[PDB]
Amino acid sequence: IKEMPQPKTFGELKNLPLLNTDKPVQALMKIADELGEIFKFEAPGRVTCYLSSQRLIKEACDESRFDKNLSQALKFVRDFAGDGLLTSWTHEKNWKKAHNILLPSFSQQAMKGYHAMMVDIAVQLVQKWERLNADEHIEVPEDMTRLTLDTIGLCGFNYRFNSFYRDQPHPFITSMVRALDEAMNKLQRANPDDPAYDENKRQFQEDIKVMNDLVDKIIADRKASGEQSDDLLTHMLNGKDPETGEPLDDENIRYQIITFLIAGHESTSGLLSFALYFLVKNPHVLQKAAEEAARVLVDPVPSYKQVKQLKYVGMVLNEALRLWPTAPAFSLYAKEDTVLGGEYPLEKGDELMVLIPQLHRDKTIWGDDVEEFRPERFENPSAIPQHAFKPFGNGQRACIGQQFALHEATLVLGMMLKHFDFEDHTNYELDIKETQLLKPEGFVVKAKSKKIPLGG
Numbered sequence: 001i002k003e004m005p006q007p008k009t010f011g012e013l014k015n016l017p018l019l020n021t022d023k024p025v026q027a028l029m030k031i032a033d034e035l036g037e038i039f040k041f042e043a044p045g046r047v048t049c050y051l052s053s054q055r056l057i058k059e060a061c062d063e064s065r066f067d068k069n070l071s072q073a074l075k076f077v078r079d080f081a082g083d084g085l086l087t088s089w090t091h092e093k094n095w096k097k098a099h100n101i102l103l104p105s106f107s108q109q110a111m112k113g114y115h116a117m118m119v120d121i122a123v124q125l126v127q128k129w130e131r132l133n134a135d136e137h138i139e140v141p142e143d144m145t146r147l148t149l150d151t152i153g154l155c156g157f158n159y160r161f162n163s164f165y166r167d168q169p170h171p172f173i174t175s176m177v178r179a180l181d182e183a184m185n186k187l188q189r190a191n192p193d194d195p196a197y198d199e200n201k202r203q204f205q206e207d208i209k210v211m212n213d214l215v216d217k218i219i220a221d222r223k224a225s226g227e228q229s230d231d232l233l234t235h236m237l238n239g240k241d242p243e244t245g246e247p248l249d250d251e252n253i254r255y256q257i258i259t260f261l262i263a264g265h266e267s268t269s270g271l272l273s274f275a276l277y278f279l280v281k282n283p284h285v286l287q288k289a290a291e292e293a294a295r296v297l298v299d300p301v302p303s304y305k306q307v308k309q310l311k312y313v314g315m316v317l318n319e320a321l322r323l324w325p326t327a328p329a330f331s332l333y334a335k336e337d338t339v340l341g342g343e344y345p346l347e348k349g350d351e352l353m354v355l356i357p358q359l360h361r362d363k364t365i366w367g368d369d370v371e372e373f374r375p376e377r378f379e380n381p382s383a384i385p386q387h388a389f390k391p392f393g394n395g396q397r398a399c400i401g402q403q404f405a406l407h408e409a410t411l412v413l414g415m416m417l418k419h420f421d422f423e424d425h426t427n428y429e430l431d432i433k434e435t436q437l438l439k440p441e442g443f444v445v446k447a448k449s450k451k452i453p454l455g456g
């Protein structure tokens with residue numbers, strides 16, 4: 001039994017002077033490099049335990065001992081995401097109901113039914129870049145976000161945000177993005193009740209009404225027509241929990257739809273953006289991935305089967321998730337008193353945070369050269385030690401979207417590689433902005449079309 005390592009405390013401020021950054025995850029990674037696989041972190045009225053090694057994370061992933069904790073970020077997002085799957089406690093009846101109903105709609109098989117709609121949006125991005133003039137460039141995370149938002153709207157509830165037809169997004173997207181920003185801003189608000197935030201609160205209420213009005217109207221519209229689509233909304237309307245026999249109610253369906261948008265859009269666009277970053281920074285890797293794309297994508301548009309063939313592309317995506325997992329942490333609490341790693345007692349209710357980018361740099365698992373981009377690390381996924389790679393979280397609370405995110409990213413990145421050569425025309429210096437997610441801010445490229453016809 002051992003005292004938990006902890007960075008220096010500064011009287012009443014505790015450890016907080018060490019995080020005076022807008023990139024706390026990257027600052028926490030530097031604390032972990034100094035203090036090792038576990039450290040306690042304290043701030044006024046807050047205590048948590050950050051884990052970074054696979055040995056201890058293997059323990060924290062034991063679901064009989066630890067469950068998902070709702071961080072404060074997730075609590076503020078629950079004000080519009082409600083008791084959707086992301087923002088609900090594992091014990092809530094609606095979490096378990098929605099999980100059992102939605103799981104089959106997110107399986108690897110279910111991907112065959114979404115493929116045509118994902119291709120629809122992916123063709124639109126390819127055509128946008130084909131139609132650029134010679135002087136222009138691409139804003140990478142901005143277009144990736146247009147793409148992921150549109151794909152989740154189409155596959156999620158057969159709704160077109162039409163993000164490629166716009167400079168300013170659809171009013172729902174504007175509201176959702178501003179609501180997420182406000183939720184994150186509230187994390188660092190000293191005097192939340194101060195008059196200067198009256199306008200913030202009013203706007204937050206307006207943005208939630210915009211989101212709810214839209215989604216409720218689409219739900220009511222669909223129930224009236226009886227139209228059956230290939231979308232998740234049809235599955236929610238027709239699904240019954242195998243355990244209770246009950247369906248989701250209309251209000252819970254609204255929260256799942258908002259949740260899929262929130263949970264899916266930034267995380268998946270970050271992944272595509274970092275993968276393209278790594279590829280333009282490693283032209284030899286980019287060449288091997290484009291060669292696979294040209295070998296495999298032999299039809300004017302990709303089939304479901306062809307996407308499954310893009311093995312190297314899949315490896316590039318995993319190695320981007322290893323270095324910069326776009327949802328960089330998840331939070332747990334001890335379900336009962338327990339001892340972690342034989343050494344550190346925990347009391348029931350104690351919080352742990354898994355620091356996924358630091359887990360992914362555990363040199364005992366990956367070798368000494370953990371900063372290098374090498375997709376070949378993933379050539380044999382069965383050989384990777386259990387719990388070493390956790391970009392989609394853990395257990396029954398893992399990413400329900402993982403097969404959807406991966407199928408979409410593979411498809412898109414494979415089409416990009418087939419149709420364009422890319423140029424890092426500004427010699428872009430990586431700048432990782434943190435919201436609740438990671439992205440390469442300001443990342444721009446030029447693409448030069450290979451002049452290959454689309455379909456079809």
Ligand code: HEM
Pocket residue numbers: 068085086087099152259260263264265267268271325326327329330331391392393394396397398399400401402404405406
């Ligand atoms: C590369 C893309 C993505 C990454 C890295 C990612 C990562 C994660 C992580 C780490 C969790 C666990 C959160 C926690 O424990 O607090 C999570 C949960 C979740 N994600 Fe994703 N995600 C991605 C894409 C998506 C997509 C495309 C969707 C939906 C279409 C989605 C929907 C969800 C949902 C609904 C949950 C809550 C699941 C549950 O608790 O039952 N995610 N994701």
